[PDB]
Ligand binder design. Structure first.
Ligand SMILES: [Cl-]
Ligand SMILES: [Cl-]
Ligand SMILES: [K+]
Ligand SMILES: [Mg+2]
Ligand SMILES: [Mg+2]
Ligand SMILES: [Mg+2]
Ligand SMILES: [Mg+2]
Ligand SMILES: [Mg+2]
Ligand SMILES: [Mg+2]
Ligand SMILES: [Mg+2]
Ligand SMILES: [Mg+2]
Ligand SMILES: [Mg+2]
Ligand code: NA
Ligand code: NA
Ligand code: NA
Ligand code: NA
Ligand code: NA
Ligand code: NA
Ligand code: NA
Ligand code: NA
Ligand code: NA
Ligand code: NA
Ligand code: NA
Ligand code: NA
Lengths: 65, 81, 119, 194, 46, 56
RNA sequence: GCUUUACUGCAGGCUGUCGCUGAG
RNA sequence: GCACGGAGGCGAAGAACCAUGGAUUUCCGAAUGAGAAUCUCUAACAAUUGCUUCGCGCAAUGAGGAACCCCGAGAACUGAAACAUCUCAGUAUCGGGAGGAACAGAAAACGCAAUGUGAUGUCGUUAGUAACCGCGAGUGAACGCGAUACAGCCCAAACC
């Protein structure tokens, strides 16, 4: 959602990796908040974070990095 | 590719170790060695890992008790997540 | 071995091979057991060479007696690849037949004599 | 005129006569010391091989195989049997020794396929046959208009399905007329009666 | 007895399959765990 | 000693276990052979025609 | 299931012969 | 998703959903570096082969599949109102292997004997005929004919 395919392709191989490690971190922190029974959740995102990560990895493959 | 750290293992006991022994507890991938746990943890929170104790849990996952150096403060590293 | 009834001295073999080489250049030679066999049969053969390191021996066993009942002379060579090289081949050869020598009909004719004498 | 080959053939008509008789007496000694399946660089009976399909070409292999002589090596019954089936000594296998030899060779060369085979004699207890096998994957063979047919997928493991030379004869498929009622098109299709 | 890492993973799973169908699933399906296994009355594999 | 109930007491030996190949608790850990799929004995999978009625 | 000088066969043992197998 | 809750989210940046193609595709598994009840130990076509730059460099095999198919191994209950040959039956079952179909196949054929037919399967028939058989019980074709579909070729050798 907040991150579309065009925008991912408009990134440089280095921006995808930077964007990748960024999403992974948001995710890890979402899971930490979740692990702590934290309610300030928004389920639609922890799910989107996974998909966003998949898209970036998909593109990195298509582009050759 | 699998990641080393899965998420913070936050429970009463985990707190006592954090407040009283400067240790952080994590749920890690069971293919990960103490060494890999030590490194990963440092690179993710910018701290100095002094010791790591592991345990293969009856939940099917691995649990690591990571002790930080007197220079780092568990209570604080954990409070930002 | 089973088809070999006499031993040819190293030196004699050399003269023979030498003759064979000049035979391919000056005269005519047949390379290969099949082609050699037909010479002996057609009588166009003057001197036939037979290797002694042939396996299976079947491929050459007939040469001797066939040659005998056809008057054609024959000499033995130890190495199969030497006869092939001497015949001008990049590969070896189990048997060769000098079909009408060349600038060697002399040396040749004499090699036949030396052998007949070698019994 | 007679081909040189014709002489190898002539010799093998009577393997216990003349020169070949002495060669055999010689060879077997070394054979008896060899293994069950031995790849050999050249066919002992060149005329035969070539006649069967052999060519001095890449991907063409020849191998001598030893098989024991005699009837079936059979175990006596361990339960009830009517007299007719209590037999042991006189029972013989329905597959001839040359076919067994072809199968043993083929198993030694999993990638190759049997093309044909012929006999090279026997002593008091062995029987030797030379099997010609082919590499269906080697170009040179794939490109040979006389052997490429064996490259087809339909020919995978010919010997094991009796599509071989001796295979078809052993199956009673020689005759096209009288006698082949229970034979052609296949034994099994005929309820196994030939 | 001494269990291996794999054995432990399996016992872990079996214990997990041993939970009850969550309350919300009842409401979501407008209305039983047939794989309920007691440690005493039942026997696991291996 | 009765061959029944009293002889059932010594049964604390482990033999058949979850097989690595087929998943059945049929891997005989003493023999290292699966009685269900043939693992340890055969590369091919264990199967017989008598596992079903002759014409089926 | 068992027995035996029941009927009929089948392993096994002994023995002649042929092949392996040749010289005087 | 089945799955009708709660919360939250995605979709006109055209989502859901469908078709095709692509990406990802943990461990065990023919399982192949070695070992192991799905894990572990210190670069791997293990093993067997073909080719070979003789180096795993280039390749092959392995295992699966509802049955069908081909090649081997091969019972007994039963029937004969007992039973031995016979029968059940080349069945059940076992070993090996192929394909999308297998197998067979262009006559050392047939032999309505002919001045005739003309590769091979299969279907119908020939026929429960010929033939077998304690000539008991039982067993049991083929040529031909009518159809289906049709297709005929390559080596070895001679001579080079
Ligand atoms: Cl084959
Ligand atoms: Cl007719
Ligand atoms: K019977
Ligand atoms: Mg420990
Ligand atoms: Mg058929
Ligand atoms: Mg619990
Ligand atoms: Mg008892
Ligand atoms: Mg392994
Ligand atoms: Mg009866
Ligand atoms: Mg009667
Ligand atoms: Mg019958
Ligand atoms: Mg007829
Ligand atoms: Na967890
Ligand atoms: Na093979
Ligand atoms: Na028959
Ligand atoms: Na229990
Ligand atoms: Na009884
Ligand atoms: Na997939
Ligand atoms: Na391979
Ligand atoms: Na190699
Ligand atoms: Na009766
Ligand atoms: Na009775
Ligand atoms: Na009878
Ligand atoms: Na007619």
């Amino acid at each position: 959602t907040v991150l579309h395919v065009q925008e991912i392709r408009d990134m440089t191989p280095a921006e995808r990796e930077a964007e990748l490690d960024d999403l992974k971190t948001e995710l890890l922190n979402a899971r930490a908040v979740q692990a702590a029974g934290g309610a300030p959740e928004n389920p639609g995102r922890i799910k989107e974070l996974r998909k966003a990560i998949a898209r970036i990895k998909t593109i990195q493959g298509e582009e050759g990095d | 590719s699998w990641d080393v750290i899965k998420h913070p293992h936050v429970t009463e006991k985990a707190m006592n170790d954090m407040d009283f022994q400067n240790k952080l507890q994590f749920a890690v991938d069971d293919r990960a060695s103490k060494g890999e746990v030590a490194d990963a943890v440092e690179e993710q929170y910018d701290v100095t890992v002094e010791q790591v104790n592991t345990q293969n849990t009856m939940d099917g996952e691995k649990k690591a008790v990571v002790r930080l150096s007197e220079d780092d403060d568990a209570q604080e590293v954990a409070s930002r997540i | 071995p089973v088809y070999v009834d006499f031993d040819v001295p190293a030196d004699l073999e050399d003269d023979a091979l030498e003759a064979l080489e000049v035979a391919r250049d000056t005269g005519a030679v047949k390379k290969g057991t099949n082609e050699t066999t037909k010479s002996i049969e057609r009588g166009s053969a003057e001197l036939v060479f037979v290797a002694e390191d042939v396996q299976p021996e079947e491929i050459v066993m007939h040469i001797p007696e066939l040659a005998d009942e056809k008057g054609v002379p024959f000499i033995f060579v130890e190495q199969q690849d030497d006869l092939g090289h001497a015949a001008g081949l990049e590969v070896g050869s189990a048997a060769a037949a000098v079909t009408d020598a060349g600038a060697a009909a002399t040396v040749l004719e004499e090699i036949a004599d030396k052998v007949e004498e070698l019994r | 005129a007679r081909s040189a080959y014709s002489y190898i053939r002539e010799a093998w008509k009577r393997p216990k006569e003349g020169q070949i008789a002495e060669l055999m007496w010689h060879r077997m000694q070394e054979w008896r010391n060899e293994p069950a399946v031995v790849r050999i660089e050249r066919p002992t009976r060149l005329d035969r091989a070539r006649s069967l399909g052999y060519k001095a070409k890449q991907g063409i292999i020849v191998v001598r195989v030893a098989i024991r002589k005699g009837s079936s090596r059979r175990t006596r019954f361990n339960k009830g049997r009517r007299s007719k089936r209590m037999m042991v000594n006189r029972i013989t296998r329905k597959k001839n020794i040359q076919r067994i030899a072809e199968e043993r060779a083929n198993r030694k060369f999993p990638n190759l396929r049997v093309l044909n085979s012929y006999s090279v004699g026997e002593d008091g207890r062995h029987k030797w046959h030379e099997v010609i096998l082919i590499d269906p994957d080697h170009p040179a063979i794939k490109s040979d208009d006389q052997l490429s047919w064996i490259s087809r997928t339909r020919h995978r493991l010919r010997t094991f399905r009796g599509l071989t030379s001796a295979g078809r004869r052993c199956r009673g498929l020689r005759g096209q007329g009288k006698g082949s009622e229970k034979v052609r098109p296949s034994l099994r299709v005929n309820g196994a009666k030939a | 007895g001494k269990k291996s890492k794999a054995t432990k993973k399996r016992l872990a799973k079996l214990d997990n399959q041993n939970s009850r169908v969550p309350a919300w699933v009842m409401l979501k399906t407008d209305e039983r765990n047939h794989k309920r296994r007691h440690w005493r009355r039942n026997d696991t594999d291996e | 000693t009765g061959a029944g109930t009293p002889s059932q007491g010594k049964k604390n030996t482990t033999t058949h276990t979850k097989c690595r190949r087929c998943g059945e608790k049929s891997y005989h850990t003493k023999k290292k052979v699966c009685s269900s799929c043939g693992f340890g004995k055969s590369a091919k999978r264990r199967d017989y025609e008598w596992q079903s009625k002759a014409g089926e």
